[PDB]
Ligand binder design. Structure first.
Ligand SMILES: Cn1ccc(C(=O)NC[C@@H]2CCCO2)n1
Ligand SMILES: Cn1ccc(C(=O)NC[C@@H]2CCCO2)n1
Lengths: 301, 301
């Protein structure tokens, strides 16, 4: 029993983290096979970051200007290319610790683990969600760029995020491992406001199922609702619309608990309308939305 | 910026996890040098667990009855002993992945990372605190016993917890790596009620400092208090008494923010007395107490 915000064990990713220095900028790189992936803004001075022309900045850079250090050993850079907002540094040595891996682009509401790193050194691991506004609410200090987000499926690491920047509101933006930003964000120190941080409804319902499985049942009520009725309430409370796809994904949790998805929606509706009245659910005084239905099944199984 | 519940990177501990089977019971073991540490209740049938005599049960066990598997490779058990509530299985092979390590017995209010494992396989990592009632609020299913709690200091793993059991209230009890339970708990399936789960006041204040550092300041007020006045309020709200030792430990956070510890106590006093009024602090609607002053400095530095 018990339900915790749980990250994937980070060992397979720790084995991939390196330090990348270009001129005076140091950040983190991901070393898979004989390629090191890092944010292209490694080539920028903080001055450059105001209006960088990355193609023009990169012309002034040679392989030997990219210093790549794996622990206390230097890697030899034999090639470099820019793909979207990441640099790919070809090194002469395949990472011997390369895990089975994929690059995936996640959808908003999907959760992943972050391995926060500084100077190529793993410093902590926490669980994130891609927010509906394509930001993440991370914990990143200067030097953390190039830290990565990932899921693990048995022995296969799916990398989904590389950290690039902090918005003035202190939320985080980054890319997939093809270097495409999540959302509208750019690797430029400019006005970039995030949109509405809506609640990931399907995740909240997953977590209410987790609560029932773990003995927290006070919020279960005598009501049901419909998707359309529930969605009127969701809209009013800046919750994501619930779709039949979401209902289908919650089917196994519905089955396990014997609570129909629409009955749980009606519980969630009353919680939105009435609040918690000073009560808690799985040790939270707010409705948690950074567990996916898959996360709840995983943790509960 | 941003403040997350962060675990230590788990790689160094993943390298130590093994499967231990005795008869029909499988749980996890910790392999350091040529010793495998595991809960002694590995030798119990679920029937045994009602009133086990461990010395008598252990007489019926030989080295060859302890099956120790590290990945898909069997370790040869050449000795076994019971130390308090753990078994030490001597194997013929030193764990080649043994990190620098210590065994530490933590105090209530101290935080640590748990690597939840099943069949010797790391399944997730989360951050815990030793509660003032010597329980932890974990996430452990059947098969998770022998999962461990740890802190990391650069390259040295301090192991502080091994998981042994779940109380009927769904909170968790375990030992240090010398096999001494935290608190009054025993490895017997009997009536074991936890005492008052009081709030770790010094941790709450640490986290309020973290909030200020990260731009969440709405709860700062015009008041101060004294340790004695604050402690009258703490007692009323089932908070741990704050000592001058706690004030001294918060000194660096006080210095960094320029908020006197007793001023932050007066903020905390108003939050206890007034509640959050539907507001949040670092994304929480309750006062978080599973960050130590050391955790806040670490994450903020
Ligand atoms: C997102 N994430 C990573 C790990 C977990 C998790 O819940 N692990 C525990 C489960 C219990 C049984 C096997 O692993 N969730
Ligand atoms: C308990 N714990 C484990 C890890 C952390 C943590 O906050 N790591 C991030 C820091 C930022 C700078 C270097 O590591 N806390």
């Amino acid at each position: 029993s018990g339900f915790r915000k749980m990250a994937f064990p980070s060992g397979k990713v720790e084995g991939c983290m390196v330090q990348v220095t270009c001129g005076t900028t140091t950040l983190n790189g991901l070393w898979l096979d004989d390629v090191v992936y890092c944010p292209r803004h490694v080539i920028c001075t903080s001055e450059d970051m105001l209006n960088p022309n990355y193609e023009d900045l990169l012309i002034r850079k040679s392989n030997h200007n990219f210093l790549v250090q794996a622990g206390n050993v230097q890697l030899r850079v034999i090639g470099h290319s820019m793909q979207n907002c990441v640099l790919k540094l070809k090194v002469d040595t395949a990472n011997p610790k390369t895990p089975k891996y994929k690059f995936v682009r996640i959808q908003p509401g999907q959760t992943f683990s972050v391995l926060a790193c500084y100077n190529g050194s793993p410093s902590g691991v926490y669980q994130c969600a891609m927010r509906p506004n394509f930001t993440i609410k991370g914990s990143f200090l200067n030097g953390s760029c190039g830290s990565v987000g990932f899921n693990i499926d048995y022995d296969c690491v799916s990398f989904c995020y590389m950290h690039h920047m902090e918005l003035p509101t202190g939320v985080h933006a980054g890319t997939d491992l093809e270097g495409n930003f999540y959302g509208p964000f750019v690797d430029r120190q400019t006005a970039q406001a995030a949109g509405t941080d809506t609640t990931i409804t399907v995740n909240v319902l997953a977590w209410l199922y987790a609560a029932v499985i773990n003995g927290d049942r006070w919020f279960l009520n005598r009501f049901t609702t419909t998707l359309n009725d529930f969605n009127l309430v969701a809209m009013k409370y800046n919750y994501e619309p619930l779709t039949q796809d979401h209902v289908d994904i919650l089917g196994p949790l519905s089955a396990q608990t014997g609570i129909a998805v629409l009955d749980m929606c009606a519980s969630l509706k009353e919680l939105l309308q009435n609040g918690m009245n000073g009560r808690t659910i799985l040790g939270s005084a707010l409705l948690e939305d950074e567990f996916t239905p898959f996360d709840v099944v995983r943790q509960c199984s």
